[PDB]
Amino acid sequence: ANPCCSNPCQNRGECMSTGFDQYKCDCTRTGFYGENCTTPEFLTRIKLLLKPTPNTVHYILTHFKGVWNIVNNIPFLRSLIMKYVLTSRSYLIDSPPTYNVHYGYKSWEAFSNLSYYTRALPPVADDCPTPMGVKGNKELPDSKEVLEKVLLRREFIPDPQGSNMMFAFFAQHFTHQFFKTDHKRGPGFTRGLGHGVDLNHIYGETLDRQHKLRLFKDGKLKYQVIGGEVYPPTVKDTQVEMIYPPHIPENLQFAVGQEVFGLVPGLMMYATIWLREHQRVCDILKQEHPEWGDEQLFQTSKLILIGETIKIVIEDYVQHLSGYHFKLKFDPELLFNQQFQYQNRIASEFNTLYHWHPLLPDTFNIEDQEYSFKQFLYNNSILLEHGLTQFVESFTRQIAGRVAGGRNVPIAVQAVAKASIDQSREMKYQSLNEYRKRFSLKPYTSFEELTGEKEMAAELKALYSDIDVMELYPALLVEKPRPDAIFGETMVELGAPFSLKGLMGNPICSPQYWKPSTFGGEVGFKIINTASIQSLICNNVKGCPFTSFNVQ
Amino acid sequence: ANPCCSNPCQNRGECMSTGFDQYKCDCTRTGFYGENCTTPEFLTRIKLLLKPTPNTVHYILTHFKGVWNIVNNIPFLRSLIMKYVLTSRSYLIDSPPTYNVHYGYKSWEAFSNLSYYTRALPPVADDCPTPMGVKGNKELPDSKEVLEKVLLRREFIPDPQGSNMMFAFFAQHFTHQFFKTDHKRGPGFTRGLGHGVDLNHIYGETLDRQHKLRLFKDGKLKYQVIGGEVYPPTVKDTQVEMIYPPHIPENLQFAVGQEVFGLVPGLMMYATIWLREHQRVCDILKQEHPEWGDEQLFQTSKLILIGETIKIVIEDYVQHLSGYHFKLKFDPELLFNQQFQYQNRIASEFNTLYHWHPLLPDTFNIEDQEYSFKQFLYNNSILLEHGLTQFVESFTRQIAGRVAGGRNVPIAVQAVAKASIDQSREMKYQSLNEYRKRFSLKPYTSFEELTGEKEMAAELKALYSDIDVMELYPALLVEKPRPDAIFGETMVELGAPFSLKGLMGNPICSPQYWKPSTFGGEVGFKIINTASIQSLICNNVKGCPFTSFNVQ
Numbered sequence A, B: 001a002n003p004c005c006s007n008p009c010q011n012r013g014e015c016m017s018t019g020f021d022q023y024k025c026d027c028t029r030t031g032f033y034g035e036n037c038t039t040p041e042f043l044t045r046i047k048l049l050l051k052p053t054p055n056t057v058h059y060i061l062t063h064f065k066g067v068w069n070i071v072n073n074i075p076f077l078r079s080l081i082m083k084y085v086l087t088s089r090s091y092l093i094d095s096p097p098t099y100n101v102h103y104g105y106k107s108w109e110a111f112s113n114l115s116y117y118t119r120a121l122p123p124v125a126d127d128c129p130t131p132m133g134v135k136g137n138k139e140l141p142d143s144k145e146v147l148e149k150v151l152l153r154r155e156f157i158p159d160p161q162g163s164n165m166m167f168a169f170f171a172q173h174f175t176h177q178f179f180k181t182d183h184k185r186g187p188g189f190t191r192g193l194g195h196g197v198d199l200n201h202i203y204g205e206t207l208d209r210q211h212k213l214r215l216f217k218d219g220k221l222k223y224q225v226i227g228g229e230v231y232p233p234t235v236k237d238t239q240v241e242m243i244y245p246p247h248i249p250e251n252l253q254f255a256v257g258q259e260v261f262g263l264v265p266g267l268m269m270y271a272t273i274w275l276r277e278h279q280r281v282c283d284i285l286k287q288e289h290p291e292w293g294d295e296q297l298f299q300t301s302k303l304i305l306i307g308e309t310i311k312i313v314i315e316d317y318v319q320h321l322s323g324y325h326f327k328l329k330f331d332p333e334l335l336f337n338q339q340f341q342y343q344n345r346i347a348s349e350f351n352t353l354y355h356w357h358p359l360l361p362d363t364f365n366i367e368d369q370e371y372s373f374k375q376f377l378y379n380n381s382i383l384l385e386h387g388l389t390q391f392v393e394s395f396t397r398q399i400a401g402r403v404a405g406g407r408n409v410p411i412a413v414q415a416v417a418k419a420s421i422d423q424s425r426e427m428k429y430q431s432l433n434e435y436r437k438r439f440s441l442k443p444y445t446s447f448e449e450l451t452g453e454k455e456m457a458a459e460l461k462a463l464y465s466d467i468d469v470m471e472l473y474p475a476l477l478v479e480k481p482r483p484d485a486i487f488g489e490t491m492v493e494l495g496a497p498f499s500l501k502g503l504m505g506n507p508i509c510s511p512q513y514w515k516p517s518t519f520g521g522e523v524g525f526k527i528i529n530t531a532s533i534q535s536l537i538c539n540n541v542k543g544c545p546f547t548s549f550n551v552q
């Protein structure tokens, strides 16, 4: 019955109901006027007829390698480009935040309550007739059918871009500091109240935890030496709360920080590399500051490690991911002369679009072995069995599945994939098209336009019947990838704006923070400014195993 | 022993210890280079030799009434001026926040932990020799001596600017949503985790509270009709936790929202006016939105009331306070084209500089009576006895004490004044001069320069011996007021930057929020844009008592 159920306001205007069966669009600053913020203002016209499309843009970024190699060596230009990608991307995210599972309207509860993931688009009014608003049928197609028909994996489809199990697991570890659904409250609620790259997955979400994981000597994190390698301390020694199956023999119940990283050796591999890293910096810092004490050593390293993380995430992780030939750059000063909010609130659409389960192969091949999901899970004895060096070697040399394209979700995690479907639904999401539009994309005219092929498209059409009812999660995985890429337009276009705001909207990037002394001097500032995934592994892994997020 | 104890870094450069008995200044972006961020860069030189002083600036703003009457009538100019006071003021506040009681260095703990009030200047290293760093004696002068000698009130000194008990009590009520020391943790810790104008003092700091204070009908706040007037409901009925002396007969234990507002009828007078206001808007909104429900009515009104508050605070409260002839303006768009962070962390220095106890008269004269502190306190029977209209009349017609100038602290709240002295000390504050400098002021060369007279100045010199050791709180109250003003340079120059950031760094002011629909339409947007203290009282008080923050 809500007159805004039809989602009538275009170009980002807001729908306000002014009656019962009447509504109104707040086209403020949308650049468009008219009943539904549709009639563009003259200047809008100009901009529109001059702005390339994500694909043409993507094309240039993907081709002309030579030109790019010139561009990448002319600092001004590089900063000029990065600055723009940085600003244009960011302008797509509401900051300060608005809307959440419970609020389709601004509200102070929505703004102040940090327990909710924010929303890029409001939920759907509960009294709307069809689950996507007004379009489509009384109910969406059965998630089990959707799952099986176009999601489940038949033959493992490797990713053409090259993503290996180093990339796959980094993505798990990294995003898991912020993606932490409080399943006690419901999807839509988070436990990462730090809403970003705060490194809580290393240090603990709370002071008590952090304090239990800490050594209180030279600023270091607690640990243990097994074999000759440095591993996280036990749950029995530290007493931190970790999630482990009742049969772990104790002694393998590592502590770490993010309570769920004991569930997969790939996470614990990284969790150990970072513990190692923290300690390393404590040493580097302590050499510079004989006068410092345990806290300033700790607090300063945590700042450096957060810097390294943001550096690696843009110049290695996202670089690989992008496919672009342009050398992305992590340089805070780029936004010192730009209007930019140094704050972030993680949106559930970024949580949902980030369920990259179609990256997990069918077996984890750790040189001389090929473990099953069943044997890999919760098995840190494998980790102690092979040990980082030959783990970075194994995983560096092991492609991951393709995310976009369709039918690549391991039937092992099919329960998780269906869950993504079911939750988006209970969270009253909007169609893939509403989202596409919200992100300046052109809505798909047919399921086939979506997929770029016919059998899945066909199966979708049978199921959803109207392209304008196609759900966001499924369509992201069942979507025509760009050339020899891992994802399609939708995934890169929604996630990009989200990923860059949380990375650049971190306080260490603010003019007041971005200065040497913040990090313990000009030496700690290099640590951040010279960080790479290769350096992270070289410095903390036994033999300087060569690494990459790309399989050779 | 900390080599930074001497506070060697000038022009806002940060001190980093690089040794044990060696330090270093991070003059980044300070505009100055050289060992102590002292040698100005050429461009700095230009700015410096062209920037008037707070007093000459103040002069112009205080004089030339006619010229101002012209400027106040040419929109462009007015926006042009307000925009600059708004931007220049704000650039004096670290946002994102840095430093706190426990951290003299940036730290993630400092940044993320919302339980601490932030710090404009870092605390003093615990291993520094003298309590202000390196300068002064092993101990500051006895607070009791300082209190009695230059703080306590002899003969009531009324404020030459005109402040009445309407102003005095509004400042109490308003600032008390954000100034809420958690005396169980220690000074330096706050309970207003909303860090600003969120109106928790009306709605409750928490959802549970809010929910108990709420009616759940038409979006209204719970209440009761006594006589014929509308007053807050009881603690018995609602069950909210209020602070009241064990002898309040129940039935006079009003609920309200800020747990300490039952302690003084002046607070409860406002707390009842705002309850009334909320309800009023619920009615206005409901008329516009027959389709809305209890939540949207509630959440929307709260946003409007937060708007009115920011409107009244800049165009009436700060307007009066300022003494300026220029018409201040609350207009969010002024900052839509400016770099500005829409966030705020309340600093303890703002808490301390805001203890305006020298405003309280010796008796509360409520037309036909002159109550003593002892009879006014916790006495809401007086409120029910006289009743808002003749309360706004009484208080409108009653000057308040002068804050600056010296010796005007009611001996009745001398315990609170001494406490301000004690706590600043325990919180390891810095001298008035360090603060003056941090706020682009010229340090006082003598106690007499500070006071603008000799007996107190003399008593101070006996006591502190070095001007450079004079403490921030005392000097604020014992300071030469500007002409016929209530405070001096330091109070206006520190508190200004603070007060404007918290007011303008509110999400409702952000481009995404500042739009009609956010407030329920173009109607609720007027409520905000046409708000005045006179309107607030007219609409909710029995006979439209004329009001003002100025005594005739």
Ligand code: HEM
Binding pocket: A168, A169, A171, A172, A175, A179, A180, A181, A264, A351, A352, A354, A355, A356, A357, A359, A360, A413, A416, A419, A420
């Ligand atoms: C073998 C490793 C993996 C396993 C077994 C696995 C398993 C799961 C499970 C059981 C959930 C929770 C399902 C629910 O009840 O809602 C989940 C959530 C998630 N997974 Fe994975 N996953 C793995 C790898 C990945 C990878 C490589 C990514 C890539 C980014 C990923 C991203 C996510 C995200 C973003 C969530 C949501 C986090 C949250 O909201 O708490 N997963 N995964």
Ligand code: HEM
Binding pocket: B168, B169, B171, B172, B175, B179, B180, B181, B264, B351, B354, B355, B356, B357, B359, B360, B413, B416, B419, B420
């Ligand atoms: C008759 C009313 C008043 C009484 C009896 C009173 C009493 C007190 C007391 C006992 C404290 C706490 C002292 C401590 O630190 O232990 C305090 C704090 C404070 N008072 Fe007053 N006061 C009154 C009026 C005012 C007014 C009119 C203002 C003007 C703004 C004011 C501003 C403050 C501020 C800013 C604080 C700090 C709040 C906090 O940090 O919790 N007070 N007052």
Ligand SMILES: C[C@H](C(=O)O)c1ccc(-c2ccccc2)c(F)c1
Binding pocket: A085, A089, A318, A321, A322, A328, A491, A492, A493, A494, A495, A496, A497, A499, A500
């Ligand atoms: C820098 C580049 C861009 O903005 O074009 C870029 C940045 C971020 C992403 C990105 C997209 C989805 C999930 C995580 C990151 C991406 F795919 C591409």
Ligand SMILES: C[C@H](C(=O)O)c1ccc(-c2ccccc2)c(F)c1
Binding pocket: B085, B089, B318, B321, B322, B328, B491, B492, B493, B494, B495, B496, B497, B499, B500
């Ligand atoms: C707007 C005006 C200005 O900046 O000049 C202004 C702003 C804030 C204050 C102010 C000063 C001391 C305590 C509280 C507020 C003030 F006294 C004057």
Ligand SMILES: *[C@@H]1O[C@H](CO)[C@@H](O)[C@H](O)[C@H]1NC(C)=O
Binding pocket: A006, A007, A008, A034, A035, A036, A038
């Ligand atoms: C605006 O949208 C409504 C609802 O979708 C539609 O019925 C109406 O005709 C549209 N009007 C214009 C001018 O676009």
Ligand SMILES: *[C@@H]1O[C@H](CO)[C@@H](O)[C@H](O)[C@H]1NC(C)=O
Binding pocket: A102, A109, A113, A115, A116, B206, B207
């Ligand atoms: C956040 O808000 C929702 C509803 O307003 C509520 O269910 C949840 O408990 C809130 N959490 C807190 C800590 O206020």
Ligand SMILES: *[C@@H]1O[C@H](CO)[C@@H](O)[C@H](O)[C@H]1NC(C)=O
Binding pocket: A374, A375, A376, A379, A381, A382, A385
């Ligand atoms: C765990 O790893 C060990 C050693 O790598 C392996 O032999 C075993 O099969 C795994 N555990 C399970 C339950 O499969």
Ligand SMILES: *[C@@H]1O[C@H](CO)[C@@H](O)[C@H](O)[C@H]1NC(C)=O
Binding pocket: B006, B007, B008, B034, B035, B036, B038
């Ligand atoms: C810098 O500050 C220190 C400590 O106050 C002082 O002793 C030193 O002489 C100053 N040097 C310069 C060049 O300002």
Ligand SMILES: *[C@@H]1O[C@H](CO)[C@@H](O)[C@H](O)[C@H]1NC(C)=O
Binding pocket: A207, B102, B109, B113, B115, B116
């Ligand atoms: C904030 O920090 C201080 C010390 O680090 C601590 O005492 C306080 O409990 C912290 N609060 C929270 C919520 O972390």
Ligand SMILES: *[C@@H]1O[C@H](CO)[C@@H](O)[C@H](O)[C@H]1NC(C)=O
Binding pocket: B375, B379, B381, B382, B385
């Ligand atoms: C409170 O004030 C009322 C009305 O002004 C007065 O009659 C009464 O004596 C006071 N209460 C007490 C306990 O004295």
